Amino acid sequence: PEGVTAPGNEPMAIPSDYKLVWADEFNTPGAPDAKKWRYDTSRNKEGWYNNELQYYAAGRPENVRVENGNLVIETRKERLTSMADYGGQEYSSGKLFTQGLADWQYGYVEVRAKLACGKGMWPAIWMMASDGSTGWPALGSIDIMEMVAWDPTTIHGTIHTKAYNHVIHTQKGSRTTAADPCGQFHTYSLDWTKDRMLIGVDGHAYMRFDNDHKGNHDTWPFDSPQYLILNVAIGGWGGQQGVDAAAFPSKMEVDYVRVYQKR
Ligand SMILES: OC[C@H]1O[C@@H](O[C@@H]2[C@@H](O)[C@@H](O)O[C@H](CO)[C@H]2O)[C@H](O)[C@@H](O)[C@@H]1O
Ligand SMILES: OC[C@H]1O[C@H](O)[C@H](O)[C@@H](O)[C@@H]1O
Ligand SMILES: [Ca+2]
């Protein structure tokens, strides 16, 4: 298959000698836990990357709230023109991350989620290196789950490095089919060790990316902590077959995040 550059085909499970080090169960309705999550508003004025169309609203229950035991990130077609950091965007959405609060070097990450559909929507569950000194894409980024809702049953798992990234079409990725990802929950899983990453759905790794063992940061920048990111972008990749006005509002629901690490 054309762009499968990091194929996987093996089971994944929480190793027996790993412990739970961090979780959000999202069982307390209201605002996300401020000891666990912060809002990224860093590019609201300038505009987000990837020709994205959304404004990411902080402190707005209409975009980001915990209810019925899930985190909800909801896209809306509206101009939040009263925000000081407004960048002319036609849509609102949310982006949460654990940056500065919680980060991990190696481990087993599980995110149970139901995804946001409608042509335009680009839900993501991903990580970035806590030390961004080398910039993107050198620092290393981990896409545990991306979906673009013009192809809503296709789940993409991808890593980006300096040598291996989407700007030069060398990203290391795979994809699999999941049943109705916007109408039912699935478990999106990362098993990250010093020697390889597995990315999967419901216990099956469809992606594997190996440490080449050359000690080259350009091919393996993953020996340092990564923080977790939950977002629903609009346009860019999500807009390849257009943005449908009728598709707003749309939500991604996250039942839980669980992170495990070797004891
Ligand atoms: O903001 C850091 C970096 O993000 C890129 O896009 C990422 C993509 O590389 C991958 O990691 O998936 C996530 C979630 O779908 C995208 O936001 C941008 O291409 C880049 O310009 C930016 O520096
Ligand atoms: O356009 C950016 C997207 O491009 C790709 O095809 C990658 O798999 C994905 O991780 C990235 O976010
Ligand atoms: Ca829950």
Side-chain angles (χ1 to χ4, degrees), residues 4 111 113-117 123-125 143-149 151-158 173-182 184 186-189 199-202 204 206-207 237:
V4 168
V111 181
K114 187 167 75 171
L115 304 192
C117 271
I125 303 161
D143 291 277
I144 304 175
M145 187 289 297
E146 297 169 88
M147 179 280 265
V148 285
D151 183 16
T153 63
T154 301
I155 306 308
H156 302 262
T158 313
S174 193
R175 64 179 177 271
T176 192
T177 297
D180 192 15
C182 299
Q184 75 193 231
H186 288 283
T187 303
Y188 303 106
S189 296
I199 294 169
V201 183
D202 298 335
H204 191 252
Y206 66 90
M207 191 273 200
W237 202 14

XYZ file of all heavy atoms in Angstrom, residues 4 111 113-117 123-125 143-149 151-158 173-182 184 186-189 199-202 204 206-207 237:
359
model
N 2.712 3.201 3.203
C 2.953 2.442 4.468
C 4.463 2.259 4.567
O 5.019 1.437 3.816
C 2.146 1.138 4.560
C 2.622 0.250 5.704
C 0.648 1.474 4.744
N -5.325 5.543 24.934
C -6.394 6.587 24.921
C -7.641 5.936 24.323
O -7.571 5.494 23.116
C -5.943 7.855 24.179
C -7.024 8.917 24.180
C -4.642 8.441 24.781
N -11.206 6.501 22.811
C -11.871 7.683 22.212
C -12.880 7.299 21.137
O -12.692 6.299 20.452
C -10.840 8.638 21.676
N -13.900 8.134 21.007
C -14.861 8.160 19.878
C -14.585 9.477 19.107
O -14.418 10.516 19.723
C -16.255 8.051 20.491
C -17.378 7.898 19.491
C -18.662 7.493 20.160
C -19.285 8.658 20.885
N -20.643 8.310 21.347
N -14.419 9.420 17.801
C -13.793 10.497 16.996
C -14.835 11.481 16.417
O -16.024 11.215 16.452
C -12.989 9.806 15.893
C -11.925 8.786 16.308
C -11.041 8.443 15.122
C -11.080 9.284 17.453
N -14.377 12.634 15.945
C -15.190 13.721 15.351
C -15.188 13.574 13.821
O -14.109 13.574 13.200
C -14.673 15.053 15.790
N -16.382 13.412 13.258
C -16.635 13.190 11.818
C -17.175 14.478 11.197
O -17.425 15.485 11.943
C -17.595 12.015 11.632
S -16.767 10.402 11.497
N -9.419 14.948 13.972
C -9.136 14.630 15.360
C -7.726 14.030 15.443
O -7.318 13.275 14.499
C -10.227 13.619 15.715
C -10.560 12.978 14.391
C -10.424 14.072 13.362
N -7.020 14.316 16.544
C -5.633 13.792 16.771
C -5.394 13.490 18.245
O -5.951 14.203 19.094
C -4.610 14.765 16.247
N -4.620 12.424 18.500
C -4.076 12.031 19.831
C -2.582 11.808 19.588
O -2.245 10.918 18.774
C -4.724 10.758 20.408
C -6.249 10.889 20.528
C -4.082 10.393 21.744
C -7.043 9.595 20.656
N 2.297 10.450 16.552
C 0.830 10.462 16.295
C 0.260 9.095 16.671
O 0.331 8.166 15.798
C 0.515 10.826 14.835
C 0.841 12.276 14.520
O -0.027 13.191 14.827
O 1.943 12.523 14.047
N -0.293 8.977 17.878
C -0.927 7.746 18.381
C -2.188 7.489 17.539
O -2.450 6.337 17.218
C -1.249 7.784 19.894
C -0.001 8.070 20.731
C -1.827 6.447 20.294
C -0.229 8.248 22.189
N -2.885 8.558 17.152
C -4.142 8.406 16.357
C -4.318 9.689 15.551
O -4.352 10.742 16.186
C -5.349 8.214 17.284
C -6.674 7.887 16.558
S -7.386 9.275 15.619
C -7.730 10.446 16.923
N -4.338 9.614 14.227
C -5.005 10.669 13.452
C -6.053 10.041 12.553
O -5.867 8.888 12.028
C -4.053 11.509 12.604
C -3.018 12.305 13.373
C -1.946 12.901 12.481
O -2.130 14.048 11.955
O -0.967 12.166 12.212
N -7.112 10.803 12.369
C -8.168 10.478 11.391
C -8.573 11.768 10.670
O -8.649 12.811 11.312
C -9.318 9.760 12.101
C -10.512 9.371 11.187
S -11.610 10.832 10.887
C -12.828 10.577 12.168
N -8.762 11.694 9.367
C -9.332 12.808 8.583
C -10.692 12.344 8.033
O -10.787 11.270 7.445
C -8.345 13.305 7.511
C -7.237 14.136 8.140
C -7.756 12.225 6.667
N -11.731 13.120 8.307
C -13.138 12.649 8.341
C -13.733 12.560 6.934
O -14.830 12.012 6.787
C -13.937 13.536 9.255
N -12.303 10.406 5.190
C -11.994 8.951 5.157
C -12.062 8.470 6.599
O -11.029 8.165 7.219
C -10.618 8.704 4.536
C -10.206 7.241 4.372
O -11.052 6.341 4.438
O -9.030 7.024 4.145
N -13.278 8.489 7.192
C -13.418 8.437 8.649
C -13.118 7.073 9.302
O -12.844 7.069 10.485
C -14.892 8.816 8.862
C -15.590 8.378 7.590
C -14.572 8.668 6.502
N -13.069 5.985 8.529
C -12.777 4.620 9.052
C -11.267 4.333 9.025
O -10.859 3.275 9.522
C -13.543 3.531 8.287
O -13.160 3.489 6.903
C -15.044 3.724 8.410
N -10.473 5.213 8.447
C -9.014 4.996 8.320
C -8.317 5.682 9.492
O -8.481 6.895 9.696
C -8.490 5.445 6.952
O -9.143 4.724 5.886
C -6.990 5.242 6.907
N -7.637 4.899 10.314
C -6.824 5.416 11.458
C -5.366 5.374 11.034
O -4.961 4.340 10.535
C -7.051 4.508 12.680
C -8.536 4.376 13.002
C -6.279 5.003 13.879
C -9.234 5.714 13.120
N -4.646 6.473 11.234
C -3.243 6.683 10.832
C -2.402 6.745 12.093
O -2.799 7.451 13.041
C -3.131 7.958 10.018
C -3.971 7.994 8.788
N -3.480 7.700 7.524
C -5.246 8.407 8.618
C -4.428 7.947 6.638
N -5.551 8.347 7.304
N -1.278 6.037 12.096
C -0.310 6.138 13.186
C 1.022 6.487 12.572
O 1.378 5.887 11.486
N 1.663 7.519 13.092
C 2.759 8.140 12.351
C 3.745 8.698 13.346
O 3.297 9.190 14.368
C 2.245 9.261 11.432
O 1.094 8.826 10.686
C 3.357 9.685 10.509
N 4.899 5.864 8.821
C 3.499 5.679 9.197
C 2.896 4.427 8.628
O 3.483 3.772 7.736
N 1.751 4.091 9.200
C 0.855 3.032 8.710
C -0.585 3.479 8.946
O -0.822 4.581 9.514
C 1.173 1.727 9.414
O 0.552 0.642 8.784
N -1.511 2.616 8.568
C -2.946 2.902 8.746
C -3.692 1.574 8.877
O -3.161 0.569 8.412
C -3.436 3.715 7.551
C -3.348 2.969 6.228
C -3.874 3.833 5.126
N -3.733 3.155 3.869
C -2.663 3.231 3.081
N -1.599 3.958 3.427
N -2.669 2.570 1.935
N -4.867 1.594 9.457
C -5.736 0.401 9.583
C -7.181 0.872 9.474
O -7.437 2.043 9.593
C -5.454 -0.359 10.884
O -6.115 -1.605 10.766
C -5.960 0.320 12.137
N -8.099 -0.040 9.268
C -9.558 0.250 9.298
C -10.075 -0.014 10.711
O -9.725 -1.076 11.315
C -10.241 -0.581 8.216
O -9.621 -0.034 7.053
C -11.748 -0.438 8.171
N -10.912 0.871 11.220
C -11.659 0.656 12.476
C -13.150 0.852 12.180
O -13.476 1.676 11.336
C -11.156 1.559 13.557
N -14.005 0.040 12.784
C -15.482 0.112 12.621
C -15.993 1.435 13.181
O -15.630 1.777 14.340
C -16.126 -1.059 13.308
N -16.750 2.184 12.373
C -17.462 3.419 12.772
C -16.732 4.153 13.892
O -17.275 4.249 14.993
C -18.860 3.086 13.303
C -19.762 4.314 13.464
O -19.441 5.415 12.898
O -20.746 4.188 14.183
N -15.534 4.757 13.663
C -14.784 5.379 14.758
C -15.454 6.606 15.395
O -15.084 6.968 16.452
C -13.443 5.764 14.111
C -13.383 4.960 12.808
C -14.834 4.853 12.373
N -16.425 7.230 14.725
C -17.204 8.372 15.282
C -18.471 7.931 16.021
O -18.999 8.719 16.856
C -17.593 9.313 14.163
S -16.098 9.962 13.393
N -18.588 4.691 17.699
C -18.246 3.778 18.818
C -16.820 4.082 19.285
O -16.061 4.648 18.528
C -18.428 2.314 18.443
C -17.332 1.787 17.541
C -17.629 0.459 16.893
O -16.802 -0.441 16.976
N -18.742 0.351 16.186
N -12.931 3.236 20.560
C -11.808 2.329 20.280
C -10.675 2.765 21.196
O -10.695 3.910 21.679
C -11.443 2.380 18.802
C -12.426 1.732 17.892
N -12.510 0.385 17.762
C -13.290 2.263 17.009
C -13.453 0.089 16.869
N -13.958 1.234 16.386
N -9.745 1.854 21.439
C -8.517 2.116 22.227
C -7.372 2.349 21.243
O -7.063 1.425 20.415
C -8.245 0.982 23.222
O -9.388 0.846 24.057
C -7.091 1.276 24.143
N -6.751 3.529 21.341
C -5.597 3.928 20.521
C -4.412 3.827 21.476
O -4.497 4.411 22.570
C -5.931 5.287 19.900
C -7.212 5.245 19.085
C -8.395 5.818 19.543
C -7.214 4.694 17.813
C -9.563 5.783 18.786
C -8.361 4.678 17.036
C -9.564 5.171 17.542
O -10.712 5.105 16.769
N -3.347 3.124 21.071
C -2.304 2.634 21.996
C -0.924 2.852 21.371
O -0.746 2.644 20.099
C -2.496 1.158 22.315
O -3.714 0.916 23.004
N 2.265 1.248 17.347
C 1.015 2.053 17.475
C -0.126 1.140 17.044
O 0.035 0.438 16.034
C 1.116 3.379 16.694
C 2.189 4.297 17.317
C -0.252 4.025 16.567
C 2.570 5.521 16.486
N -1.243 1.183 17.756
C -2.318 0.241 17.412
C -3.724 0.707 17.722
O -3.919 1.704 18.366
N -4.675 -0.117 17.317
C -6.096 -0.015 17.698
C -6.531 -1.329 18.319
O -6.275 -2.363 17.681
C -6.947 0.289 16.471
C -8.408 0.474 16.883
C -6.399 1.485 15.753
N -7.217 -1.258 19.469
C -7.851 -2.393 20.169
C -6.845 -3.552 20.290
O -7.179 -4.667 19.883
C -9.129 -2.782 19.425
C -10.143 -1.652 19.394
O -10.080 -0.801 20.298
O -10.985 -1.631 18.461
N -4.195 -4.346 18.614
C -3.422 -4.726 17.406
C -2.499 -3.597 16.914
O -3.007 -2.570 16.452
C -4.325 -5.158 16.260
C -3.484 -5.761 15.208
N -3.235 -5.119 14.019
C -2.738 -6.883 15.215
C -2.419 -5.853 13.298
N -2.126 -6.959 13.995
N -0.648 -1.975 14.065
C -0.607 -1.838 12.593
C 0.591 -0.980 12.210
O 0.881 -0.821 11.037
C -1.940 -1.257 12.123
C -2.188 0.145 12.597
C -1.772 1.231 11.852
C -2.790 0.385 13.825
C -1.979 2.520 12.308
C -2.991 1.671 14.309
C -2.599 2.742 13.538
O -2.827 3.997 14.004
N 1.305 -0.425 13.197
C 2.485 0.425 12.918
C 3.618 -0.047 13.818
O 3.377 -0.260 14.967
C 2.151 1.902 13.161
C 3.177 2.911 12.675
S 4.417 3.155 14.009
C 5.127 4.731 13.545
N -5.334 18.710 6.180
C -5.558 17.282 5.834
C -7.039 16.906 5.940
O -7.498 16.194 5.046
C -4.682 16.407 6.733
C -4.407 15.055 6.165
C -4.605 14.601 4.899
C -3.987 13.932 6.942
N -4.266 13.281 4.821
C -3.916 12.833 6.068
C -3.703 13.768 8.290
C -3.524 11.580 6.501
C -3.313 12.522 8.724
C -3.200 11.450 7.832
